[PDB]
Design a protein around this nucleic acid. Structure first.
Ligand SMILES: [Mg+2]
Ligand SMILES: [Mg+2]
Ligand SMILES: [Mg+2]
Ligand SMILES: [Mg+2]
Ligand SMILES: [Mg+2]
Ligand SMILES: [Mg+2]
Ligand SMILES: [Mg+2]
Ligand SMILES: [Mg+2]
Ligand SMILES: [Mg+2]
Ligand SMILES: [Mg+2]
Ligand SMILES: [Zn+2]
Lengths: 100, 131, 107, 106, 50, 62
RNA sequence: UUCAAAUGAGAACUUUGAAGACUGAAGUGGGGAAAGGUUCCACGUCAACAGCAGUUGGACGUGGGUUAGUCGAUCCUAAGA
RNA sequence: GUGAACAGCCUCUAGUUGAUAGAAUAAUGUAGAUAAGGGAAGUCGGCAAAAUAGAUCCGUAACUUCGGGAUAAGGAUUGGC
């Protein structure tokens, strides 16, 4: 187990070329947390309670915007040169219709 | 194989061997003969100032003194302490002439050893006095 | 057929005599060829952690033997030309010596 | 000179979640705090106590919060909690153990 | 140069305003024989020579 | 997608080089929406963009 | 130089992440003088050009951007005109 | 950092990873090395390579415009603790 941990640490670490990312800035997943705690042999009841509370707090409720524009797109003609509403188009301002 | 080892240990650039130097140091007469050499023009320092252990001539007495005050000479002296590794050592290591090798080692321990040590001490004090 | 096995690959005899700037890329290509030989799949995908294991000691410092976990799985996309593909993962062990081909039970 | 300095550590969140042992942590600190270059030399110098939520270290001989954090991180690595639990400071000489940011699985 | 004279900057401004392709409505005119801008200039093709 | 501008803006806002800026590879659309330094600051605050630590040059052997 | 994902009809060459390397402060870094004149930046975008490729570009199309009593010119004189 | 040192070599900050690619390893080349014994017998010609090289100590001729020649020549040493 000690030799295996040495090999895993060697494959993980690359300290000569760059630094390791900070854990205080990174975030990880509850599935990995649960499986690591299960490997360590702890009790996951409290952690599962916290995760269930977080999942029940994180709910998605539809609104009028989701009902009306959920699958729609555009609603405005895209310009040929990618210009704004009041931006002059040197090439195309003198031709009103798209056929011409 | 490499250039350094080739140009140092080429056959034509060979040096005197440890067993021969040990045999030279063993007897007082040989030490006296190597200390009192005829003046040879083909040797540095007219054949004088000759370190027997390193088998090396020096051009000057100060050169000999600086050589004695050096780690190379100390390394040679440390090498010349024990058995000089003749063919009998390898033969007995293989399992051949074991009694002959044991008798040789016993003779070295009893007779050759202390006399060679005393000759080395006399040579050391003579070099210290003359230098 | 979905399957998963563990192998030891001898990269030493596959990289014997290779120019130093090509050793790790040739190790990548040889591992792909190894997976194609053992699974019959033209589509072989290497894990980035496996790429790290290959490149750990620079461009010319590939290990003599590597312990690999090869999984033949199903290609779910319709636009893909092949129904199956191989996915190669590193098996970080104490040593890659004295190990035989084994089958991993998928749960 | 030798003014007593007190450092407090709050292990309440990992202890309540049940992946931490305050008594084991206090015993590790007792065994591994060095004085004048040697372990087990805490004679009337460093006192470590715990009550299930707070671990208190009162020292009069060359102890710092950086050293306490170093020893706590060594203990966390030994118990394989280095990737999940970190040592944070709330105010001067008062610290806590906090879990890293975890998103719910959903 | 960054520190330039007003005469140089004015000539640069005129060149910038001249740098354009044809308007599309020119091509639609009756008996139009102009099909491209034959005097177009780019900064890496023909130097203005002050 | 093309996040070259967002990487440059993140480097300028954080105050380090482009070599020290980490963009979350999962929030690609969220980064592509950020066309302003204010939006880049929001991304840095919520953790989509992270500043890496410096590569160590230890002096222990010295 | 390599791996994965994204984009895309199409990826050896685009983007992000993961790796291996290099310039090694007399730099492949950060600014300027002469010169160039918009090449700067954003959006759109691939017919021609980038002696392979290209979804990329100092390319093509449409625009945005250079704020001074104290920084310069402007003033002084030099060899000279 | 090593080192007398803006030398060479390695690293931090910053910046690049650009130059058509893939597969094999015949001859002949371009660039770089090694070689038993002999040691210029080669060639118009020691062309080219090899040998020497830092620092410390001993010591250093003819000649001379007395300032030099001179690092002349010729010898010994170098690590770690
Ligand atoms: Mg070969
Ligand atoms: Mg170099
Ligand atoms: Mg380097
Ligand atoms: Mg082309
Ligand atoms: Mg640009
Ligand atoms: Mg343009
Ligand atoms: Mg030879
Ligand atoms: Mg001849
Ligand atoms: Mg001849
Ligand atoms: Mg001379
Ligand atoms: Zn000697």
């Amino acid at each position: 187990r000690q030799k295996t941990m040495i090999a895993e640490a060697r494959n993980r670490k690359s300290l000569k070329n760059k630094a390791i990312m900070p854990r205080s800035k990174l975030t990880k997943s509850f599935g990995k947390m649960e499986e690591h705690m299960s490997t360590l042999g702890h009790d996951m009841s409290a952690l599962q309670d916290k995760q269930n509370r977080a999942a029940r707090k994180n709910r998605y409720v539809e609104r009028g915007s989701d009902v009306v524009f959920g699958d729609q797109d555009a609603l405005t003609a895209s310009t040929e040169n990618g210009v704004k509403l009041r931006q002059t188009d040197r090439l195309l301002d003198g031709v009103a219709d798209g056929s011409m | 194989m490499g250039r350094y080892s080739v140009k140092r240990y080429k056959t034509k650039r060979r040096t005197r061997d440890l067993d021969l130097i040990y045999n030279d140091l063993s007897t007082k007469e040989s030490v006296q003969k190597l200390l009192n050499q005829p003046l040879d023009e083909t040797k540095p320092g007219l054949g004088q100032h000759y370190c027997i252990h390193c088998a090396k001539y020096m051009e000057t007495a100060i050169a000999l003194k600086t050589h004695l005050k050096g780690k190379v000479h100390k390394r040679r002296v440390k090498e010349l302490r024990g058995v000089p590794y003749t063919q009998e050592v390898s033969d007995a290591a293989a399992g051949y002439n074991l009694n002959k090798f044991l008798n040789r080692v016993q003779e070295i321990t009893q007779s050759v050893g202390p006399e060679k040590e005393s000759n080395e001490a006399l040579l050391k004090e003579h070099l210290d006095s003359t230098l | 057929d979905v399957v998963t096995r563990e192998y030891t690959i001898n990269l030493h005899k596959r990289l014997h005599g290779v120019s130093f700037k090509k050793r790790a890329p040739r190790a990548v290509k040889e591992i792909k060829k190894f997976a194609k030989l053992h699974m019959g799949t033209d589509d072989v995908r290497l894990a980035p952690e496996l790429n790290q294991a290959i490149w750990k000691r620079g461009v010319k410092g590939v290990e003599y033997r590597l312990r690999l976990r090869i999984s033949r799985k199903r290609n779910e996309e319709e636009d893909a030309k092949n129904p199956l593909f191989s996915y190669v993962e590193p098996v970080l062990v104490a040593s890659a010596k004295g190990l035989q081909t084994v089958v991993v039970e998928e749960d | 000179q030798k003014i007593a300095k007190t450092f407090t550590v709050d292990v309440s969140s990992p202890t309540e979640n049940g992946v931490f042992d305050p008594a084991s942590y206090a015993k590790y600190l007792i065994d591994h705090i060095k004085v004048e270059g040697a372990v087990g030399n805490l004679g009337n110098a460093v006192t470590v106590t715990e009550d299930g939520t707070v671990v208190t270290v009162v020292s009069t001989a060359k102890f710092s919060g950086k050293y306490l954090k170093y020893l706590t991180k060594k203990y966390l690595k030994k118990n394989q909690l280095r990737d999940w639990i970190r040592f944070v400071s709330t105010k001067t000489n008062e610290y806590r153990l906090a879990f890293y940011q975890v998103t719910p699985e959903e | 140069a960054a520190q330039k004279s007003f005469r140089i900057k004015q000539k640069m401004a005129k060149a910038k305003k001249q740098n354009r392709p044809l308007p599309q409505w020119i091509r639609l005119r009756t008996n139009n024989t102009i099909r491209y801008n034959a005097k177009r200039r780019n900064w890496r093709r023909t130097k203005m020579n002050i | 997608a093309n996040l070259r501008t967002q990487k440059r803006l993140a480097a300028s806002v954080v105050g380090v080089g482009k070599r020290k800026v980490w963009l979350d590879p999962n929030e690609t659309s969220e980064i592509a929406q950020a066309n302003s330094r204010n939006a880049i600051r929001k991304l840095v605050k919520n953790g989509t963009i992270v500043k890496k630590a410096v590569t160590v040059h230890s002096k222990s052997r010295t």
